[PDB]
Every structure is written in C-alpha cells, then in structure tokens.
Amino acid sequence: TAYGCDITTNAVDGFDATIYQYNANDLRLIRDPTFMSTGYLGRNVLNKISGVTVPGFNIWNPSSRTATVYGVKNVNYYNMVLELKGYFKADVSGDYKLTLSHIDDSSMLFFGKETAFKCCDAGSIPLNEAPTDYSLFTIKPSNQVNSEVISATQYLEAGKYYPVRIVFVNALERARFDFKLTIPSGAVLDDFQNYIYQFGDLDENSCHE
Amino acid sequence: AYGCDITTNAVDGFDATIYQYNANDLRLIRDPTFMSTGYLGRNVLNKISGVTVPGFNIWNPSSRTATVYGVKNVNYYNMVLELKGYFKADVSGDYKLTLSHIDDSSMLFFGKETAFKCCDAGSIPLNEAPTDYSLFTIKPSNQVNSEVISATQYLEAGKYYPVRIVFVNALERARFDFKLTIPSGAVLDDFQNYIYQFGDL
Ligand SMILES: CC(=O)N[C@@H]1[C@@H](O)[C@H](O)[C@@H](CO)O[C@H]1O
Ligand SMILES: CC(=O)N[C@@H]1[C@@H](O)[C@H](O)[C@@H](CO)O[C@H]1O
Ligand SMILES: [Ca+2]
Ligand SMILES: [Ca+2]
Ligand code: NA
Ligand code: NA
Ligand code: NA
C-alpha cells in the first residue's frame, strides 16, 4: 500500500558487492542462465564490500591475478563472480536506461518493480526484493571481441525505489564490467551516487510507539 | 566452415510456430524455464513460414481470434508464438534488435555465427551455436509494459546467426513490437532479407 515514507533516514548510499569463487578458465558456466541467476550462490564467498557508487571497472594485469577492486586490495579479479545489489531511486519521473557494454566475460541484470514500504519512526523498511526473472544477459564469445551493447529502459516514478541485482563473471584474464545509467535528461552516468541505496535494518518492535 | 559456395536452399522469413497456452495463466509468462524450453511441449496450433513482418498489436474485445501473419482465426488471445530463423546481412556493421511494450512476455535469443556443412545441393547449418545474448521482458499486471529492451551487436557480412524469439499472450491484448535498426540508422519493421531458413535437401 505505501510506496514511500516521510522518514527515510536509514537509507545509505551504494551497492552491496559480494564476490564469489569461480573456477579459472571455465567458459561453460558463464553461458548458463541457471548458474548466472542462482547457481553462483553456492560458491565460497571471497569478499563483502558496501558503499559502492561507481560499479564499473576494466582490469587486466598480465603479472597478477589479483588487484584492488572497490578499494579492497588483493581481490581475485582474474576468476570470480561479482554480485551487486541495492535499491534504485528515481529522482525525476521518466525513462531510465541501464546498459551493459562489451562485458568480459558475462553479466546478467535483474530490475524489479517498485517496492512497497513499511514506514517506521526510525526509517523505512522495503517489503519487496529478489526479483527473480532477468532482463539482460550478455556473454563474450570465446576468444573474440564482445561487441554487444544491451539495454533495458523503463519508466520510473519520481521518488520511488526499485530493487536491482547485477551478476558479473570473469572466467580468466581481463575483467571488463561496463555498466551505465541514462537518466531522463539524457545524461549518461557511470556514478550511481544519489540513485543507489541500501536501507538500514531497524527494531521492528519499536517501528511505532 | 562459416559459409558455403552453394546456398541455393536458403529461403526468406521467420518460421512461426503457435502453441496452446492456458487463458489467464499469469504464472508461466514469468517462468524462465517455460519461456526458454517448456513451451515446446505444448500442442501446436499453427505453423506459418515466410514471415517477413513479425510485429503485431492485436486486441478484439469481442473475439479471441484474429488474423495473424495472413492466417485467419488464430487464437491470439492466449497463445505462445515462437519465431526462428538465421539472421544475415551483406553489410557488416552494428545491428540492433528492439522489443517494446510487450504484452504479455517475450524472451529473445541470439547466437554466434553458425558453422555449416557444405553439400552439392546446398548448405546445412550445424546450429549448435553458443548464445551471444538473451533478453526477457514481462508486462506487469496493473499497467502497460513501459519496457523497451534492445541488443546491438556488430555482425559480419554474409554470416548466419541463429535467432529465436518466444512471445506469450495470456489474455486480451497481444502486443509484440519488434524492430530492426540497421547500420545506416534506419529502423525497419520488415525483416524479409535479413532472416533466412535452410531447406532440407
Ligand atoms: C587479455 C584478454 O583480453 N583476455 C580475454 C579474456 O578476458 C576472456 O575471458 C577470454 C575468453 O573470451 O578471451 C581472452 O582473449
Ligand atoms: C486490454 C488490455 O490491455 N488487457 C491487458 C492484457 O493484455 C494483459 O495480458 C493483462 C495482464 O497484464 O492486463 C490487461 O489489462
Ligand atoms: Ca575474462
Ligand atoms: Ca495480454
Ligand atoms: Na570492445
Ligand atoms: Na468490441
Ligand atoms: Na520496413
């Protein structure tokens, strides 16, 4: 029933990133839609990183299988699964486009309908989460250029929040994750600050007095 | 081999297969297994070849049937449609496929170039091509689907890329808006000379 709240002081910036183990040189699972949507969740977690507003990167170090990713040293970029999750807030009403470009090796994106909220004294609690059906799935052909640029545009309402999940896999060597936002003005952004949020948990016993 | 000298068995247009779908089933339209493979188990209602203009937008408040792809009395109100073919252009460059405002749902698959067995009477696509990308769009129950979903890729002149589009109408309006943008920037509704089949020999 409520798609917004007066008190949203518990909203904080950024995607939450989870990095999972992935077998080096596996060019099969990157094309497997079940693996990209759910199967990856069974792998060992390597890192958890919050506060991420600039999600894109293009990393290749011929001399190291690790690199600094999202401010964290020694991340195993060479072979990994990355999951990014959060709530996208539309500022103004209009068509917003999410674009995945030249991905190496593969990525799948999920974008949900507007979340409802429970409104509490100390903040808002989003009720909807885990959209399960993907919109976009892009895969680099083995050993050839990824010329694919794939996008999803939809109308968003000013002030409303939409859950989003992006899954990215690097099987070996270069990790290229190019993820861009086009807002209704036509501006193209690689920085999601003031558009991407988490909602802090609160004590549901004291939601109201 | 990604091409052959003799391709005299190639003909134009998508091949359409229309399958039975239960009216008012708003569950399977959002089931990715159903949209990718499950539909293939349903009863076939129509087979239509030579489909050149694949898009349509049909709603008759007084009838559950309509003319689709020149065929009278197609059960548009509740159906699965599968379009398949091989995409080819003779001009290398960026091509975009776009699905818009789909009612009720659609899933699109685009494969890498197919290899061939070249024979005296024609070419045989080996058609085990790994997927390049896929798109999935679903209309929400309470509103027009605002989604416009597209894929652009650089395609090579003379290469054949398998393409498959699955569309479902669960009830009422069947909106399947599917367009091609070619390297010149022109936006086309007609796919005739961009989509091919290979005849059995
Ligand atoms: C240095 C480089 O570009 N390596 C890419 C690699 O990232 C990709 O995972 C692999 C399989 O497509 O193909 C290689 O050419
Ligand atoms: C006339 C019309 O647009 N009817 C639509 C129908 O096509 C759609 O399948 C259904 C479920 O989303 O919602 C109805 O409002
Ligand atoms: Ca790679
Ligand atoms: Ca419908
Ligand atoms: Na490139
Ligand atoms: Na009528
Ligand atoms: Na046309």
How far apart are alpha carbons A98 and A10 in whole angstroms?
A: 26
Gyration radius (Cα) of chain B, Å: 17
C-beta of B171 in contact with ligand 2 (< 6 A): yes
Under 8 Å between Cβ of B159 and B153: no
- Are B138 and A133 inside 8 Å of each other by CB? yes
Find the CATH number of the domain harbouring B114: 2.60.120.1560
- Cβ-count burial of A8 within 10 angstroms (0-12 exposed, 13-18 middle, 19+ buried)? middle
- Are A139 and B154 inside 8 Å of each other by CB? no
Gyration radius (Cα) of chain A, Å: 18
CA atoms within 13 A of residue B187's CA, in its CB half-sphere: 8
- Are A134 and B137 inside 8 Å of each other by CB? no
Grouping H, G, I as helix, E, B as strand and the rest as coil, residue B34 is helix
State the CB neighbour count (10 A cutoff) for residue B163.
Answer: 20
Q: Could you tell me whether strands B66-68 and B116-119 are parallel, antiparallel, or unpaired per DSSP bridges?
A: unpaired
For residue B168 the two structure tokens come to 């479902």
Grouping H, G, I as helix, E, B as strand and the rest as coil, residue B53 is coil
To the nearest 10°, report the CA torsion of A190, B143, A138, B112.
-140
Grouping H, G, I as helix, E, B as strand and the rest as coil, residue B155 is strand
Residue B4 one-letter amino acid: C
- Cβ-count burial of B171 within 10 angstroms (0-12 exposed, 13-18 middle, 19+ buried)? middle
Number of domains observed in the structure of chain A: 1
Experimental method: X-ray
C-beta of B10 in contact with ligand 2 (< 6 A): no
DSSP chain A: -BS--S--TTEEESEEEEEEE--TT--SGGG-HHHHHTGGGGSPEEEEEEEES---EEE--TT-S-EEETTEEEE-TTSEEEEEEEEEE-SSSEEEEEEEEEEESEEEEEEPPPPPEEEETTEEEE------S-SEEEEPPTTS----EEEEEEEE-TT-EEEEEEEEEE-SS-EEEEEEEE-TTS-EES--TTTEEEE----GGGS--
- Cβ-Cβ contacts under 8 Å, A105 against chain B: none
Distance (Å) from the alpha carbon of A35 to chain B's nearest alpha carbon:
13
Its domain, for residue A97, covers 1-209
Grouping H, G, I as helix, E, B as strand and the rest as coil, residue B36 is helix
Contacts of B158 (CB under 8 A, 6+ apart): B3, B88, B90
Resolution of the experimental model, in Å, one decimal: 1.7
How far apart are alpha carbons A177 and A170 in whole angstroms?
A: 9
Nearest listed ligand to the Cα of residue B192: 7
Rounded to whole angstroms, the maximal C-alpha distance in chain A is 61
How far, rounded to the nearest angstrom, does the alpha carbon of residue B170 sit from its chain's CA centroid? 18
A152 C-alpha vs ligand 3 centroid, how far in Å? 24
Element (H, E) at B44: strand B44-51
Residue A187 one-letter amino acid: A
Task: Give, in order, the Cα–Cα distances in Å from A208 to each of A47, A199, A204.
Answer: 36, 17, 8
Task: Give, in order, the Cα–Cα distances in Å from A173 to each of A23, A57, A62, A64, A78.
Answer: 12, 13, 8, 9, 5
Under 8 Å between Cβ of B18 and B12: no
Closest CA to A97 of A17, A24, A25, A180: A180
- Total residue length of chain B: 201
Closest CA to B39 of B88, B85, B80, B92: B80
Under 8 Å between Cβ of A64 and A76: no
